[PDB]
Amino acid sequence: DIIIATKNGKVRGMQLTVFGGTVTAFLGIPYAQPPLGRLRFKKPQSLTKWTDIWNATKYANSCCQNIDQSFPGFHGSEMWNPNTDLSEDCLYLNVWIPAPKPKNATVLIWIYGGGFQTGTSSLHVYDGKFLARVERVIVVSMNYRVGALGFLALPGNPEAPGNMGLFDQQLALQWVQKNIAAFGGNPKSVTLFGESAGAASVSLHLLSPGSHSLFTRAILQSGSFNAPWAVTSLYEARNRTLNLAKLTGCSRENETEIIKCLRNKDPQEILLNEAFVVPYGTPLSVNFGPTVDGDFLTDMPDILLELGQFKKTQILVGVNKDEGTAFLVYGAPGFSKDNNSIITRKEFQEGLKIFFPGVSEFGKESILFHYTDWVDDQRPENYREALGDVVGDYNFICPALEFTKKFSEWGNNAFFYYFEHRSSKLPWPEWMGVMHGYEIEFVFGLPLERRDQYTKAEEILSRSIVKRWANFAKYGNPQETQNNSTSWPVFKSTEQKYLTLNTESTRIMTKLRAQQCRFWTSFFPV
Amino acid sequence: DIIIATKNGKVRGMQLTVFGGTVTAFLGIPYAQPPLGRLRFKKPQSLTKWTDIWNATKYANSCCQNIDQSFPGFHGSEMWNPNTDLSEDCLYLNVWIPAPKPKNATVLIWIYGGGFQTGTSSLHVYDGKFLARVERVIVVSMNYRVGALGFLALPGNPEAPGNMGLFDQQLALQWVQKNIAAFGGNPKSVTLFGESAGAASVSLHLLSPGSHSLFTRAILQSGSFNAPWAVTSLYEARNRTLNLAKLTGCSRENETEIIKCLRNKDPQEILLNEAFVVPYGTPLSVNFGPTVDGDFLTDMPDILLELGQFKKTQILVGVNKDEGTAFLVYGAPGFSKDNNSIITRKEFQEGLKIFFPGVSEFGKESILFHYTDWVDDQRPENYREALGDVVGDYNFICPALEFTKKFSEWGNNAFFYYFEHRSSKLPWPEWMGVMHGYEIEFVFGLPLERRDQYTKAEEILSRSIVKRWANFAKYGNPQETQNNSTSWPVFKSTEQKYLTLNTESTRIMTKLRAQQCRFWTSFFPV
Amino acid sequence: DIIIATKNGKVRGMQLTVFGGTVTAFLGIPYAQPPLGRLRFKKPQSLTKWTDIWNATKYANSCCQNIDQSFPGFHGSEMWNPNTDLSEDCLYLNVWIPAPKPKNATVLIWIYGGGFQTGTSSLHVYDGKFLARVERVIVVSMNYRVGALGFLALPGNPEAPGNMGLFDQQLALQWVQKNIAAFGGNPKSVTLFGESAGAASVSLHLLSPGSHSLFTRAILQSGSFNAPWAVTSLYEARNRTLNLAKLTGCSRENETEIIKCLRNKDPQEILLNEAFVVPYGTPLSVNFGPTVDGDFLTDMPDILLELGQFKKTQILVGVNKDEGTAFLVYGAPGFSKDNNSIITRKEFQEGLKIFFPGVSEFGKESILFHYTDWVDDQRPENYREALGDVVGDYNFICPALEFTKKFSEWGNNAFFYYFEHRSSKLPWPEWMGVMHGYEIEFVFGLPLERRDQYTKAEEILSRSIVKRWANFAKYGNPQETQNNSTSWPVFKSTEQKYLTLNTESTRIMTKLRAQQCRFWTSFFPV
Numbered sequence A, B, C: 001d002i003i004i005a006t007k008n009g010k011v012r013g014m015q016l017t018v019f020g021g022t023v024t025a026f027l028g029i030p031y032a033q034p035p036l037g038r039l040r041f042k043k044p045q046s047l048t049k050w051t052d053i054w055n056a057t058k059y060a061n062s063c064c065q066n067i068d069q070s071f072p073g074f075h076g077s078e079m080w081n082p083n084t085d086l087s088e089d090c091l092y093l094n095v096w097i098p099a100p101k102p103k104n105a106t107v108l109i110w111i112y113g114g115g116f117q118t119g120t121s122s123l124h125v126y127d128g129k130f131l132a133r134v135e136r137v138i139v140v141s142m143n144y145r146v147g148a149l150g151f152l153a154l155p156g157n158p159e160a161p162g163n164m165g166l167f168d169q170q171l172a173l174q175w176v177q178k179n180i181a182a183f184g185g186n187p188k189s190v191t192l193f194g195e196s197a198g199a200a201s202v203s204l205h206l207l208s209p210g211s212h213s214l215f216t217r218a219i220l221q222s223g224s225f226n227a228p229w230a231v232t233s234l235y236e237a238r239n240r241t242l243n244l245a246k247l248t249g250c251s252r253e254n255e256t257e258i259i260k261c262l263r264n265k266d267p268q269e270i271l272l273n274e275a276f277v278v279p280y281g282t283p284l285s286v287n288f289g290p291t292v293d294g295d296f297l298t299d300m301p302d303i304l305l306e307l308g309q310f311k312k313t314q315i316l317v318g319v320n321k322d323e324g325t326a327f328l329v330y331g332a333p334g335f336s337k338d339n340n341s342i343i344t345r346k347e348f349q350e351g352l353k354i355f356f357p358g359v360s361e362f363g364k365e366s367i368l369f370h371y372t373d374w375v376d377d378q379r380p381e382n383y384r385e386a387l388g389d390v391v392g393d394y395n396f397i398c399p400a401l402e403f404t405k406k407f408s409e410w411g412n413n414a415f416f417y418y419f420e421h422r423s424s425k426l427p428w429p430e431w432m433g434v435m436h437g438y439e440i441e442f443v444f445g446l447p448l449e450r451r452d453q454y455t456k457a458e459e460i461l462s463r464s465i466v467k468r469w470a471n472f473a474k475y476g477n478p479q480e481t482q483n484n485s486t487s488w489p490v491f492k493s494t495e496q497k498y499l500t501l502n503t504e505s506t507r508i509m510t511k512l513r514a515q516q517c518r519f520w521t522s523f524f525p526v
């Protein structure tokens, strides 16, 4: 029986057998006051003693959020949907620790993605018992509020100041600072890791003065705050808060009255109107996201990055080979998970409209000009491939490269990976390739479990990735030093070296997407 | 209703609408005991609690000072004259803060120019509500004593020790250290900025051990302590204190009796005799200025600069294209604001006498030799242009370049600008060009106010300058990172790169006034 | 009336008119318990409150010491003899401060030479009122014990542990740390300066862990611990302590009994037998000097220097053109202050015997071979010049160069001077040239006093040297920045640049005495 005394009370955990060993999991520990009633849309408030043995033996509620009902019954999409009840009372975190209890273990804190509109820490692909077992690190993960409830912003107004879900993540990081030594953890060796919006969140904790001392290093998988979906302008946020108000009959003349009104709405009426706060959306819409609130984020983060105002530490950054494909089946014409999606030039052009709402005509021709000079015009999957690359390069890959470039110019070691392995079990079709989100199960070690029907080459790839992530967290260097592995070079402006992750053998290459990102990065920002 | 609790009591401010937003202004907060009676000519004494809600709702009195009556009725000159009552009771400061109240805002502290003989913080061109509104910085500005009342020196004698007006500025900087967090300010991010004598003052706070920890960075507009008007020798100061005494029938044998006598004179008798403490003056005379007092200034500041004894931090330094023209209408023969001032060779020579009192004949021929080799002797405005350049290069431009050169040799980033835009509203005539003092309204944002009849190109120039000054203060780097702007390089001995500020497009150039300043800087110091 | 409160009591000083200004001198303040009776040969003991206004209005007693009676009546020698009564009660120091009292003045602490056998701080050439007046520094100087009474060593035995006179200097440096702020001094800006044995002492305070935090920078005039006269081996010290014992009928079997016996002898019987503790001496004999005592000096100081174990700071080091001449009239055959001393080859060889006691015959031939290859054999002053250079290069110049070389290799700025001006008033004859000891009056400013019959070129030279020493102390850089002076380069291994000090104009040169010092430094150590 395992009871740990925390600053706020005792917690009981549960033992887990993993790979003939034991991990202790403390699932669903609370880290803030439930943000209900009068606390809705406010910054999370600190938690007071229970006393009391809190039983942390199951995952807690996930935060309220719309769910993906596009493919009912389909594992590829439904695997991302919440797997605990939804509730505004969702501010909990999970701790997994090796057994026997470590002495001063390095801590890995996971921040989930989901567009800032969705996600939960209890997903199966985020289960941190493999990492704790195999690498003897402690893994922590937290639920933070998403959608309007986590990011609604009425700028400067503490009733809805914005970034609440980023302040939830932050209060979780404090909880680790204050409490993790009790579980056997080293609060001085804490690495944040996150994917997509979770990565973008990691990148903003790098810029946030209040997070500076809550962690040591950072890992960004498929995301960074400079991605075009990751920060809402003050203009847009205002328009959106008011549009939500209007749609819920909460329009007022006094803004504090708007918020008061919205605090009376049911979680569901808020969720139902989120999608419409915007005249046209895309499959990549982030209606309620991070904003420059003067608190968490003191200035437009592009200025902070350019001028070197951020936590000085090592970063590990990466992307997958086919980032953009996943999104094309949520609204691009001619695209289906259920056929090979060979689309036409005219369809490609219609797709640009779906993904680039407006976007001058000249803007959209320019994408077309850049991506459709074939070599050569023979290949029927030409336009289908091009639309996926457009969406991935713009939304994920070039913004990750440009973040890494700018961060490293201030003197810190940065490591960049290009993940190019398609899981043998991917439920999505072949044409979608190495999709967004599908490195995650490799990082968390799921392929280490033989009972699971991954290939042997995949077990070995995962084992290597886990070692590299763990050495990065413990030592700031993502090497696998024992098995004559390719040495991972730092990424510098100038050479821009990166490491490819695949089952055959990993290469050092240079200047990923050079020609493409010159387009997105220099020209497109029409 | 906005009340802030300060170390010395409460203060009430007032709300201001600026650009559809709100700024809170706390005008006329006191920062020292009024320096009256027995405190006249003494260092400022700290302030004791009122208690009490101090109403900071209007600008305070300006310090006693002679006024410019050369052009009664004329906006070009009268705009610099005080606009609140004169009084020895003038030790107040102003705070402008964004609304809503910032969390930890960068602070900009303005130090006015006026030759150390005049000036006030309440002038319209020093109004810091635009900066606070637009950049969300806090702006502070203080009145400090000027003329004999601020700088009379009887060396080593604490009844008149010298530099009192520099100690007023310093006590204001402490007040910001102790109190600005209460208004939402970061005392660890404080930038001083000042023009002309205000800049010279900024440059001496860089050398003053007692100011070292009262600020972070420095901006010097048109001035630096090494300018020939900015520091009085001990010889001159003594002669001048005694001359003043003599002129007010205060001559004594005992020096403390001189001061005691002068403490009985009326503000006005002191002001009236200031101009005469010197056998011949120029339009650039600084009769009572900074001195090496062994307290504020521990050694001749040229030695401190050469040998690297100064606060190690970034500086932003600049000058205007026609610095010297403004002065020529206050006594050079043939010059008038009311015609094109085409003067003759013989007039030019008479002008050198006005500006270089004595100055050997050889000294003055040498200026003439250096500035009157025309290319070619055709042009009638030849001599008129030459006299203005003589006066600007000697008094402002070369001393600013040489300061920047010497400061940067010790390893700090320095940025240098050359301001070359003539305001569309300048009341002075065309031949006077881009005058001394007329970048100020651009730095403070006045052209951002459309209701004001500046051109569109001027709004844009001002907006850019404000961003560059603000990024310098917040991040030590005066870049405008968002609008594909010219990147501002650091100034190094060796290349001496500088940025030109004008409405068309800004250039990077090198070695401003190279041939001229070699003359003033190496040879002239005849 | 000027009274200063010190940690140990009050002290009254006296006002002095210097150059139409005022200096306050506190002459003869005590800094330790008188080391009498049972404290003889022991480390100095700290001082307890008097209370009490101590009157510091005259120089105190000088420490017991033999006196130079070679030239009774002659100013050249007698100027170095003590000018206050001799007494074991001699542990006092002097403070000179500018008036008005400075705020946080740099402190210069003088340590006198005299071979560790003689000297006193009250000499006229060490009077620090000119420095205090002219440069507004505070000057401190202390008497420390010399001869057997200051340096007798019975190794490891606290009754006579050795280096007592170096511990007197050290306790004086503490007194400045604890007390000088009260006089207006900055204990964080303290420079030690010393000549000959006083310089050697400065160089050992650089190596002494207990002095590390008692000062900032160091000046070494004509001396450094690696000079062949400056450190006594443990062998020699033992032999000498026992020889003294024997000569005073104090031989015992128990060593503590030897010391007890010697503590009963009269100052005079000790002084009288000092000269004989050694079978043969030279005019440069240092019978009782610094030793490696395991306390002040933890290891042979040559090892500490080579291996970089010393205070890391700037040093200023120098020598005079004719160091060795002064000594030749105290025993070399054919030499006289009263004729031109043209000696013969055979006389030169006899001189080597006087100066190199033993010294194999081969050792002495080798000096002769190195110094007597004339260019050419014509010149009658050939051998007279050669003997002086031998004595100066060996004893002073090469050891100063080698110290500077080795100190600078660890990364600190070092400045080296070669002083080549013969005082217009030197009482010694012309052939003796620029003698040892005769830069001192220039460093202390005596030529600044016109009433004194130095030439105008000498006033100017002294004024420059004073400025350079003062800037070194205040700023770590011995420049004279105002009068277009030659810039003094740092001394590096590799170039070995040095500055010449003379009345005409100073040069930068390289590799002083290169060929000579290769001999003394590499080969001679036969």
Ligand SMILES: *[C@@H]1O[C@H](CO[C@H]2O[C@@H](C)[C@@H](O)[C@@H](O)[C@@H]2O)[C@@H](O[C@@H]2O[C@H](CO)[C@@H](O)[C@H](O)[C@H]2NC(C)=O)[C@H](O)[C@H]1NC(C)=O
Pocket: A235, A236, A239, A242, A243, A244, A246, A247, A276, A277, A278, A279
């Ligand atoms: C700010 O909002 C308006 C859209 O107004 C919205 O009303 C909301 C309650 C919501 O239902 C939303 O769907 C609706 O559009 C944006 O301007 C809109 O542009 C289109 C173009 O035809 C119009 O049809 C909309 O009605 C029009 N607004 C209206 C009704 O006046 C506007 O673009 C947006 N600003 C942004 C994009 O930041």
Ligand SMILES: *[C@@H]1O[C@H](CO[C@H]2O[C@@H](C)[C@@H](O)[C@@H](O)[C@@H]2O)[C@@H](O[C@@H]2O[C@H](CO)[C@@H](O)[C@H](O)[C@H]2NC(C)=O)[C@H](O)[C@H]1NC(C)=O
Pocket: A332, A333, A334, A335, A336, A338, A339, A340, A341, A342
């Ligand atoms: C691949 O399928 C897409 C997706 O749309 C279809 O899904 C199919 C599996 C099928 O069940 C079909 O009924 C369903 O609508 C096809 O795109 C569609 O093309 C059809 C053919 O006319 C159009 O009618 C639809 O408008 C269009 N769907 C939309 C709204 O995007 C696509 O043609 C098919 N392409 C292949 C096989 O290459």
Ligand SMILES: *[C@@H]1O[C@H](CO[C@H]2O[C@@H](C)[C@@H](O)[C@@H](O)[C@@H]2O)[C@@H](O[C@@H]2O[C@H](CO)[C@@H](O)[C@H](O)[C@H]2NC(C)=O)[C@H](O)[C@H]1NC(C)=O
Pocket: B235, B236, B239, B242, B243, B244, B246, B247, B276, B277, B278, B279
């Ligand atoms: C120090 O002052 C004297 C000037 O004496 C002055 O008396 C004052 C009260 C004031 O009224 C002032 O105008 C008057 O000059 C300077 O020397 C002066 O040089 C001129 C040359 O002819 C004489 O006419 C002045 O009278 C003469 N002084 C006198 C009257 O003895 C002197 O230059 C100045 N020192 C400086 C410049 O530092």
Ligand SMILES: *[C@@H]1O[C@H](CO[C@H]2O[C@@H](C)[C@@H](O)[C@@H](O)[C@@H]2O)[C@@H](O[C@@H]2O[C@H](CO)[C@@H](O)[C@H](O)[C@H]2NC(C)=O)[C@H](O)[C@H]1NC(C)=O
Pocket: B332, B333, B334, B335, B336, B338, B339, B340, B341, B342
């Ligand atoms: C430009 O004007 C100057 C300034 O002096 C004059 O101001 C004018 C606008 C006018 O009202 C005139 O009365 C006033 O004195 C002129 O300099 C002057 O030149 C005049 C002509 O003789 C002389 O008499 C004055 O001594 C001299 N003024 C002084 C004391 O500086 C100047 O000539 C004129 N030049 C032009 C038009 O190019």
Ligand SMILES: *[C@@H]1O[C@H](CO[C@H]2O[C@@H](C)[C@@H](O)[C@@H](O)[C@@H]2O)[C@@H](O[C@@H]2O[C@H](CO)[C@@H](O)[C@H](O)[C@H]2NC(C)=O)[C@H](O)[C@H]1NC(C)=O
Pocket: C235, C236, C239, C242, C243, C244, C246, C247, C276, C277, C278, C279
């Ligand atoms: C250690 O001392 C002896 C010298 O013994 C000395 O007795 C002393 C009291 C003193 O009077 C001193 O003058 C006398 O020499 C040194 O050895 C000496 O070498 C010479 C060579 O002929 C002899 O004449 C000395 O007497 C002889 N010592 C004796 C008497 O035994 C010895 O060199 C010295 N060790 C050193 C130099 O460290």
Ligand SMILES: *[C@@H]1O[C@H](CO[C@H]2O[C@@H](C)[C@@H](O)[C@@H](O)[C@@H]2O)[C@@H](O[C@@H]2O[C@H](CO)[C@@H](O)[C@H](O)[C@H]2NC(C)=O)[C@H](O)[C@H]1NC(C)=O
Pocket: C332, C333, C334, C335, C336, C338, C339, C340, C341, C342
């Ligand atoms: C320079 O003088 C030296 C020093 O010795 C002498 O001092 C002289 C001023 C004179 O009074 C003389 O009496 C005194 O002894 C001379 O050296 C001496 O040379 C003499 C000449 O025979 C010898 O007898 C001495 O032994 C020797 N003195 C010693 C002991 O050193 C020297 O000769 C003289 N040389 C010149 C003038 O060039």
Ligand SMILES: *[C@@H]1O[C@H](CO[C@H]2O[C@@H](C)[C@@H](O)[C@@H](O)[C@@H]2O)[C@@H](O)[C@H](O)[C@H]1NC(C)=O
Pocket: A103, A104, A106, A186, A188, A189, A190, A216, A473, A474, A475
């Ligand atoms: C735990 O280690 C603490 C220092 O941690 C450092 O070492 C590594 C873990 C590295 O990743 C860095 O994060 C850290 O700088 C030490 O101060 C504590 O005392 C230790 N606590 C224990 C063992 O109880």
Ligand SMILES: *[C@@H]1O[C@H](CO[C@H]2O[C@@H](C)[C@@H](O)[C@@H](O)[C@@H]2O)[C@@H](O)[C@H](O)[C@H]1NC(C)=O
Pocket: A209, B103, B104, B106, B186, B188, B189, B190, B216, B473, B474, B475
């Ligand atoms: C306010 O920030 C403090 C540190 O300020 C630094 O960050 C920038 C503002 C920069 O310009 C530098 O001037 C500073 O080094 C921090 O110590 C305080 O805790 C903060 N105070 C708050 C938020 O209350």
Ligand SMILES: *[C@@H]1O[C@H](CO[C@H]2O[C@@H](C)[C@@H](O)[C@@H](O)[C@@H]2O)[C@@H](O)[C@H](O)[C@H]1NC(C)=O
Pocket: B209, C103, C104, C106, C186, C188, C189, C190, C216, C473, C474, C475
């Ligand atoms: C006196 O100055 C102190 C710091 O002294 C530094 O500055 C120069 C004097 C330099 O030579 C260095 O020696 C020192 O690092 C400061 O800490 C004290 O507060 C000052 N004391 C006063 C003015 O009372």
Ligand SMILES: *[C@@H]1O[C@H](CO)[C@@H](O)[C@H](O)[C@H]1NC(C)=O
Pocket: A012, A055, A057
């Ligand atoms: C808490 O849960 C544990 C684990 O299932 C159980 O054994 C324990 O009795 C529970 N305690 C209570 C009563 O909350």
Ligand SMILES: *[C@@H]1O[C@H](CO)[C@@H](O)[C@H](O)[C@H]1NC(C)=O
Pocket: A254, A255, A256, A257
């Ligand atoms: C807005 O209404 C809220 C309701 O409590 C009130 O607190 C606030 O003062 C009001 N402000 C105004 C006048 O708009």
Ligand SMILES: *[C@@H]1O[C@H](CO)[C@@H](O)[C@H](O)[C@H]1NC(C)=O
Pocket: A463, A464, A467, A480, A482, A483
């Ligand atoms: C190294 O390879 C071995 C087998 O040769 C494998 O079992 C092990 O897991 C590998 N270690 C890592 C961290 O990849």
Ligand SMILES: *[C@@H]1O[C@H](CO)[C@@H](O)[C@H](O)[C@H]1NC(C)=O
Pocket: B012, B055, B057
């Ligand atoms: C101070 O001035 C304010 C603003 O005008 C006013 O409302 C307030 O009543 C004043 N308080 C007093 C009586 O000083």
Ligand SMILES: *[C@@H]1O[C@H](CO)[C@@H](O)[C@H](O)[C@H]1NC(C)=O
Pocket: B254, B255, B256, B257
């Ligand atoms: C000068 O006069 C003042 C008047 O108070 C006095 O304090 C001071 O001691 C006097 N000094 C002298 C003697 O000059």
Ligand SMILES: *[C@@H]1O[C@H](CO)[C@@H](O)[C@H](O)[C@H]1NC(C)=O
Pocket: B463, B464, B467, B480, B482, B483
């Ligand atoms: C950038 O340019 C835009 C318009 O393209 C302008 O409105 C904005 O004020 C500029 N920003 C700065 C800081 O110059």
Ligand SMILES: *[C@@H]1O[C@H](CO)[C@@H](O)[C@H](O)[C@H]1NC(C)=O
Pocket: C012, C055, C057
């Ligand atoms: C100390 O000496 C001073 C200066 O000569 C003298 O004025 C004072 O009275 C003395 N005090 C005593 C009695 O020691």
